[PDB]
Amino acid sequence: TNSQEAAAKHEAQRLEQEARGRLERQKILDQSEAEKARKELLELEAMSM
Amino acid sequence: QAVFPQNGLVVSSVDVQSVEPVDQRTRDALQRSVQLAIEITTNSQEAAAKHEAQRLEQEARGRLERQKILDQSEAEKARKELLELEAMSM
Amino acid sequence: LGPDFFTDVITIETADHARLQLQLAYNWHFELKNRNDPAEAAKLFSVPDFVGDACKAIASRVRGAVASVTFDDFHKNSARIIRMAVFGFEQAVFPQNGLVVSSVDVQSVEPVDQRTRDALQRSVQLAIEIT
Amino acid sequence: LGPDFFTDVITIETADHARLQLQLAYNWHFELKNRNDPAEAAKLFSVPDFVGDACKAIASRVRGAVASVTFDDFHKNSARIIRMAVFGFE
């Protein structure tokens, strides 16, 4: 049962790992789209200045 | 099926109904083990729902931020035309 | 010997040592190919007590089919299990008395561990809660 | 044996171990192809108690159809479920 404990623990740690990496990848995607919108906004801003 | 020729007895089947080991610790640790099994399943559901809500939170933040960028764009254009009127004014 | 189903309660325990109570109804009726044949009636009376026989036997089928099943698998699908336990894989029949169980309605499952039902009910409660 | 529906209350529990009570009416009536045929009446009297039979049987249909259903699915659509449980699918 202790082996089951370590197994479930390491398993939850694994899903936590995949969840963190996935959500981080999601941050990167949002940062990308935000970078593009920020770029077009920089077009309007540079033209403004 | 089991057979006892000496008396012609025949055991067609043997239903089992209970197993009760003398060690209290055996059944206690076993029951705690399965209890922790459903416990780690519901905990897995907890982490799943948690990470899921975190995911929708992620998409919501990125989407709303994109909306900020769009509003900043339209506001940049209106600000530009306003700069036309202002520069002509000065 | 009419259809009038009789209720039955037999306890069983999972291979993972998890005890649980059951409330399980039994639909039942005796077939009669003919009023004319005495021998079928001799089958009807061959049993000292057809209800006790059917209860102990079907309960043996249940404890047998379920004890082999893991406690990894005990949820709503278990209703599929016992239903396939009572019925021949391809209605239950007892030739010795001509008994025929057309169906087996289930009405309750009550595991002895309070923590099981409590954690389960909290789990579904947190399910609608996270919805 | 007229249409006069009789009420019925049978408890059931979801596969996810969630108990629930029910208040469920039953519309009912005995068909009669002819006054002329004794045998149909023999069917009418073949049951020791038609109400108890119909209650236990339909309740078996309900507990059976619903226990197979997930507690993921218990909302207003369940009314669609039991209605299709009592009635033969086509």
Token pair belonging to D26: 């039953």
Interface of B with C in 9-38 (CB under 8 A): 13-19, 26-27, 30-31, 33-35, 37-38
Task: Provide the shortest C-alpha distance from residue B90 to chain C (in Å).
Answer: 58
In order, the DSSP letters of D11-75 are: -EE-TTS-EE---EEE------S-SS-HHHHHHHHHSS-HHHHHHHHHHHHHHHHHHHS-TTS-S
d(CA C63, CA C12): 6
In order, the DSSP letters of C93-118 are: EETTTTEEE----EEEEEES-HHHHH
Determine contact, residues A1/B33, Cβ cutoff 8 Å.
yes
d(CA A49, CA A28): 30
d(CA D85, CA D67): 12
d(CA D57, CA D3): 19
Dihedral angle computed from the Cα positions of residues D70, D73, D79 and D85, in that order, rounded to the nearest 10 degrees: -30
The strand ranges marked E within chain B are 2-4, 9-11
d(CA D23, CA D7): 8
According to DSSP, residue B21 is labeled: -
- Beta bridge partner(s), residue B3: B10
Determine contact, residues B27/C17, Cβ cutoff 8 Å.
yes
> Solved by what technique?
cryo-EM
Q: What is the resolution of this structure in A?
A: 4.9
d(CA B62, CA B55): 11
d(CA C119, CA C105): 26
Nearest one of A37, A44, A22, A43 to B62, comparing CA atoms:
A37
Determine contact, residues C27/C3, Cβ cutoff 8 Å.
yes
Beta-carbon contacts of D21 under 8 Å, excluding residues fewer than 6 positions away, are D9, D11
Q: Is B26 on the interface with A (CB under 8 A)?
A: no
Interface of B with A in 29-48 (CB under 8 A): 29-30, 32-33, 36-37, 40, 43-44, 47-48
Nearest one of D6, D44, D13 to D27, comparing CA atoms:
D6
Q: Which residues of B touch C119 (CB under 8 A)?
A: 35, 38-39, 42
Nearest one of C87, C128, C123, C124 to C104, comparing CA atoms:
C87
Q: How far is CA D26 from CA D3, D9, D51, in A?
A: 10, 10, 10
Q: Which residues of B touch A29 (CB under 8 A)?
A: 62
Determine contact, residues B16/C67, Cβ cutoff 8 Å.
yes
User: H or E element: which one contains B63?
Assistant: helix B24-89
Q: Which residues of D touch C5 (CB under 8 A)?
A: 53, 56-57, 60
d(CA B69, CA B75): 10
